[PDB]
Amino acid sequence: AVTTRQITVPSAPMGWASWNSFAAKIDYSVIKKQVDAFVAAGLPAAGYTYINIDEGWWQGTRDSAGNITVDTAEWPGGMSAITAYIHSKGLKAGIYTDAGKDGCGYYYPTGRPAAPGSGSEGHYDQDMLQFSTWGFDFVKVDWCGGDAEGLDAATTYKSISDAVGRAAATTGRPLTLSICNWGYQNPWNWAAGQAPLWRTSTDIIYYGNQPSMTSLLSNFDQTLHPTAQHTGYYNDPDMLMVGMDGFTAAQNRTHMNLWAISGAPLLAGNDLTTMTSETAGILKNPEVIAVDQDSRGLQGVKVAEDTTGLQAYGKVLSGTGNRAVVLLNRTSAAHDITVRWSDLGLTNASATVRDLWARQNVGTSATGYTASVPAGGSVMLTVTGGTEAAGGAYAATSTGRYTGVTAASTGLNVVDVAYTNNTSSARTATLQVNGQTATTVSFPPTGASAGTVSVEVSLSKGSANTLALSGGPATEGITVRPLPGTNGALVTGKQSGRCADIYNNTITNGTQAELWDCNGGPNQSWTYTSRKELVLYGNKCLDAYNLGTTNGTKVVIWDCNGQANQKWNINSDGTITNVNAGLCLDAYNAATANGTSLVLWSCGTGDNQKWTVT
Ligand X SMILES: O[C@@H]1[C@@H](O)[C@@H](O)CO[C@H]1O
Q: Which of the residues are catalytic?
A: 142, 203
Contact window for ligand X (CB under 6 A) among 121-129, 458-466, 497-505, 571-579: 497-505
Q: C-alpha dihedral over 183, 189, 194, 197, to 10 degrees?
A: 50
Smallest gap, in angstroms, from Cβ of residue 68 to ligand X?
Answer: 17
Q: Applying CB under 6 A, does 523 fall inside the site for ligand X?
A: yes
Smallest gap, in angstroms, from Cβ of residue 559 to ligand X?
Answer: 8
Smallest gap, in angstroms, from Cβ of residue 610 to ligand X?
Answer: 11
* Residue 543 marked as a ligand binder: yes
* Residue 563 marked as a ligand binder: yes
**Interface of this chain with ligand X, residues 76 to 135, rule: CB under 6 A:** 104
Smallest gap, in angstroms, from Cβ of residue 188 to ligand X?
Answer: 11
Contact window for ligand X (CB under 6 A) among 123-131, 460-468, 478-486, 512-520: 512-520
* Residue 501 marked as a ligand binder: yes
Q: Any bridge partners for residue 214, and if so which?
A: none
Quick note: the x/- pattern for ligand X over 189-208, rule CB under 6 A, is --------------x-----
Question: Judging by beta carbons within 10 Å of its beta carbon (0-12, 13-18, 19+), is residue 277 exposed, middle or buried?
Answer: exposed
User: How many C-beta atoms lie closer than 10 Å to residue 393's C-beta?
Assistant: 10
Q: Applying CB under 6 A, does 545 fall inside the site for ligand X?
A: yes
Total chain residues near ligand X (CB under 6 A): 37
The DSSP element (H or E) to which 86 belongs, if any, is: helix 79-87
* Residue 517 marked as a ligand binder: no
463, 406 in Cβ contact below 8 A? yes
**Interface of this chain with ligand X, residues 454 to 493, rule: CB under 6 A:** none
Which of 180, 195, 468, 600 contacts ligand X by CB under 6 A? 180
34, 18 in Cβ contact below 8 A? yes
**What Å distances lie between residue 161 and 88, 183, 190, 413, CA to CA?**
28, 17, 12, 30
**What Å distances lie between residue 39 and 50, 377, 445, 552, CA to CA?**
12, 30, 32, 61
The DSSP element (H or E) to which 212 belongs, if any, is: none
427, 421 in Cβ contact below 8 A? yes
Which of 516, 526, 537, 568 contacts ligand X by CB under 6 A? 516
Q: Applying CB under 6 A, does 248 fall inside the site for ligand X?
A: no
Measured distance CA(410)–CA(26) in Å, rounded = 50
Our CB check for ligand X shows the closer of 141 and 379 to be 141
For helices 249-262 and 213-223, angle between their N-to-C axes, nearest 10 degrees: 10
**Nearest C-alpha neighbor of 460 from the set 416, 407, 424:** 407
Binding site for ligand X (CB under 6 A): 19, 54-55, 104, 142, 144, 180, 182, 203, 436-437, 501, 503-505, 514, 516, 519, 521, 523, 543, 545-547, 558, 561, 563, 565, 586, 588-590, 595, 601, 606, 608-609
Please give the annotated binding residues for beta-D-galactose, written as ranges: 54-55, 104, 140, 142, 182, 199, 203, 586, 589, 608
Please give the annotated binding residues for alpha-L-arabinopyanose, written as ranges: 54, 104, 140, 142, 182, 199, 203, 437, 501, 504, 519, 523, 543, 546, 561, 563, 565, 586, 589, 608
